[PDB]
Design a protein around this ligand. Structure first.
Ligand SMILES: Cc1ncc(Cc2csc(CCO)c2C)c(N)n1
Length: 352
């Protein structure tokens, strides 16, 4: 009868000790209430990195803000009042709030924060402000960066646009015309800088790096990747005193944000229930504590502060987001999504 379909961001950490796989998204799911305000609540995994899923939105969904402006253009999302979101999330960083803003309007509740952070060892032989700077200072094959070494589509597409584009505001909104279509459109200067980072990257996966740290013999004192990817050594990061920081590939540091948005076809009775479910997701201390176990970052200052009270890891990031608040950029797409990203990455790859 009256059911609320909730689409969750499914790309959360996963623990594994051979055979048995524990997914953090399952832990969070088995904590959220299935009965709210008379409505039945269905939590399912919503893959925003699938064009098919972006074509059929649920009542409420968690999408990467990278597709948000394009998602707004389809009209499938509902505009929200500034006060309504503020009363749920609380204080938001400038880049976080701007990541949910499209055409001077808020289109969802910021849920997750992420970036390619730099995990520096205690024996950090070098310090840097950009990955280009760290590439020159340390040298050939010294930094661990799995997504760059493996040339992941979103990373190949991502870094290229970060090096190329520049903005005064936080939102770096690009169109489909700004994408290389062949090879004569590929900026060689940008591709030259990407190569320097790739040259400074060791040919090693994430699993190989983690196992090295666990065995006490790290393959490198430098690691770049998602905060969630470091969750299997969160104790070692704390004990041995590893360092984390917002580092840009060049100049400005980039950030991913996942945003809980409401469908445009929601009635007034469903809108209040959806907000209630959302307010639970963002403020429930048990949910936040579970996020802390997977080292994934809440988007609001309150969620970050809560986890910063018992984690030095979160403490550094909270200091980082505050110190470089005006410098952080967020890449977004105006009139394209996954297909055009995968295609653009395929064009760029040979020139790397
Ligand atoms: C919380 C969080 N962590 C990481 C990401 C970034 C990501 C995760 S999977 C994926 C697909 C790559 O092919 C990307 C870009 C995100 N959006 N939110």
């Amino acid at each position: 009868p009256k059911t609320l379909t909730v689409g969750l961001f499914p790309y959360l950490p996963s623990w594994n000790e051979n055979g048995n796989e524990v997914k953090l998204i399952n832990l969070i799911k088995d904590v959220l209430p299935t009965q709210v305000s008379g409505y039945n609540i269905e939590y399912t995994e919503f893959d925003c990195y699938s064009d098919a899923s972006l074509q059929s939105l649920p009542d409420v969904f968690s999408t990467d803000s990278i597709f948000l402006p394009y998602l707004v253009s389809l009209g499938g999302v509902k505009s929200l009042d500034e006060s309504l979101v503020r009363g749920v999330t609380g204080d938001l960083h400038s880049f976080v709030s701007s990541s949910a803003s499209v055409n001077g309007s808020v289109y969802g509740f910021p849920q997750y924060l992420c970036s390619n952070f730099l995990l520096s060892s205690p024996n950090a032989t070098q310090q840097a402000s950009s990955l280009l700077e760290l590439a020159q200072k340390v040298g050939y094959e010294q930094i661990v960066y799995p997504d760059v070494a493996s040339s992941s589509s979103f990373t190949v597409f991502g870094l290229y646009q970060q090096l190329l584009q520049s903005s005064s505001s936080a939102a770096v909104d690009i169109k489909a015309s700004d994408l290389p279509q062949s090879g004569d459109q590929v900026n060689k200067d940008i591709t030259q800088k990407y190569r320097t980072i790739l040259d400074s990257t060791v040919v090693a996966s994430q699993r190989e790096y983690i196992n090295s740290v666990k065995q006490g013999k790290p393959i490198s004192n430098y690691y770049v990747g998602y905060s969630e990817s470091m969750c299997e050594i969160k104790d070692i990061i704390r004990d041995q005193q590893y360092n984390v920081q917002l580092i840009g590939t060049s100049d400005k540091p980039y950030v991913y944000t996942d945003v809980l948005a409401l469908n445009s076809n929601l009635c007034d009775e469903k809108q209040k229930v959806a907000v209630e479910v959302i307010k639970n997701l963002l403020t429930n201390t048990l949910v936040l504590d579970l996020l802390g176990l997977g080292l994934t970052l809440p988007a609001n200052k309150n969620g970050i502060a809560h986890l910063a009270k018992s984690s030095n890891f979160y403490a550094q990031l909270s200091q980082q987001f505050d110190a470089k608040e005006s410098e952080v950029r967020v890449l977004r797409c105006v009139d394209f999504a996954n297909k055009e990203v995968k295609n653009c990455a395929g064009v760029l790859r040979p020139f790397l």
